[PDB]
Amino acid sequence: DPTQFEERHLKFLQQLGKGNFGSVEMCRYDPLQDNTGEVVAVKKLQHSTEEHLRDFEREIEILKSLQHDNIVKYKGVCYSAGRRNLKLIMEYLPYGSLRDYLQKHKERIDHIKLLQYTSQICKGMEYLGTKRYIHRDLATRNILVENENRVKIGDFGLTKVLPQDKEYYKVKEPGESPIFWYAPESLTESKFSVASDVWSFGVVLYELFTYIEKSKSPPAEFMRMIGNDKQGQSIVTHLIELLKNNGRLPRPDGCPDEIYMIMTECWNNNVNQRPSFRDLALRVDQIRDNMA
Numbered sequence: 001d002p003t004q005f006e007e008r009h010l011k012f013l014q015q016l017g018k019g020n021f022g023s024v025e026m027c028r029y030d031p032l033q034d035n036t037g038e039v040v041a042v043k044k045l046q047h048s049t050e051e052h053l054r055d056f057e058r059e060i061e062i063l064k065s066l067q068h069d070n071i072v073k074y075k076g077v078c079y080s081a082g083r084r085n086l087k088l089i090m091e092y093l094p095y096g097s098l099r100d101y102l103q104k105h106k107e108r109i110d111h112i113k114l115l116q117y118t119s120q121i122c123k124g125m126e127y128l129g130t131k132r133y134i135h136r137d138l139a140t141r142n143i144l145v146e147n148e149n150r151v152k153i154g155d156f157g158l159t160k161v162l163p164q165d166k167e168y169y170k171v172k173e174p175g176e177s178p179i180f181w182y183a184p185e186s187l188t189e190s191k192f193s194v195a196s197d198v199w200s201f202g203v204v205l206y207e208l209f210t211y212i213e214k215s216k217s218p219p220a221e222f223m224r225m226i227g228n229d230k231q232g233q234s235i236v237t238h239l240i241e242l243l244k245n246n247g248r249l250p251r252p253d254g255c256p257d258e259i260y261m262i263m264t265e266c267w268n269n270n271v272n273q274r275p276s277f278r279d280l281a282l283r284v285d286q287i288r289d290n291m292a
C-alpha cells in the first residue's frame with residue numbers, strides 16, 4: 001500500500017537534476033490536497049523508449065534491493081496506464097548533491113568532516129559490492145547530503161550486476177560515459193568491476209580535497225595533461241596513453257599525505273593491487289581516529 005503511489009496526487013515542487021537519460025524532481029505526495037503530504041524525490045525518464053524503460057526498471061530493482069545508511073532509500077514506484085511509464089519514488093535528501101554542498105561551503109567543511117563523508121561513501125560502496133553490483137558512476141555529483149553528518153550514494157542509473165561466473169561486467173555499446181572517473185581497463189576494454197569502482201572512489205577522494213575548485217576538476221586537469229587541443233575520440237586515446245604512462249591527477253593543495261597515498265593506491269594500473277572498500281573504510285576510520 002505505501003510503496004504504491006498515485007501520479008495524480010504527486011505535486012511538482014522543483015527540479016533537482018538531469019543526469020543520465022532522465023530527470024529528478026522534488027514532489028509532494030499529497031492525496032489530501034492540503035499541502036500536508038510527504039516531500040519525496042521522483043526520478044522519471046525524459047525519453048522513455050522500450051530500451052530505456054527496461055534499464056530503468058532494473059535500476060529500480062537495484063535500488064529496492066539495497067538497505068544501507070549510506071544509500072538513498074527507495075520508497076516506491078508510480079505506474080502509468082497503457083504504455084506503463086515508470087516513476088521511481090525515493091527519499092528527498094534536502095542538502096542536495098555533495099558536489100554542490102562542498103562547492104558552496106568550501107574549506108568551511110574541515111578535513112575531519114571530509115573524512116567522515118569519505119568513510120560513509122566507502123561503507124555504502126562496500127555494501128554495494130556484497131550484492132555484486134558495480135556502480136560505474138561514483139562521483140561527488142552522484143552523492144547526496146542528508147544533513148551535515150550523513151551522505152548517501154545515489155544515481156544507480158549506470159549500475160550493473162556482475163555475471164554469476166565473472167568478476168567484471170563488459171559494456172558492449174556504451175552510452176554517455178564519465179571517462180575522467182574511469183579506470184584504464186574501463187577505457188580500453190569497457191570492463192567494470194569492484195576494482196574500477198575503487199579507481200572512481202580515488203577520483204571522488206580527489207574531488208573532496210580540491211573542494212570542487214573548477215580549474216582543478218578531473219576533466220580540467222586531465223584535459224590540461226593531454227592538451228586542451230584534444231577533441232572527441234582523440235581525448236579517450238590520449239587519456240589511455242597518459243594513464244598507461246602513470247599520468248595522474250595532482251595532489252590537491254593542502255591535502256594530507258596519508259589521504260593522497262590512498263588516492264594514488266586506488267589509481268593503480270594493476271587491477272588486483274587496488275585496495276578493497278573493506279580496507280579503505282578501516283584505513284579512513286583509523287586516520288579519523290588519529291585526527292580526533
Ligand SMILES: COc1cc(-c2ccc(O)cc2)cc2cnc(N)nc12
Nearest residue numbers: 017024041072092093096154155156
Ligand atoms: C540528482 O539528485 C538526486 C538523485 C537521486 C537518485 C537516487 C538513486 C537513483 O537510482 C537515482 C536518483 C535521489 C535524490 C534525492 N534527493 C535529492 N536532493 N536529489 C536526488
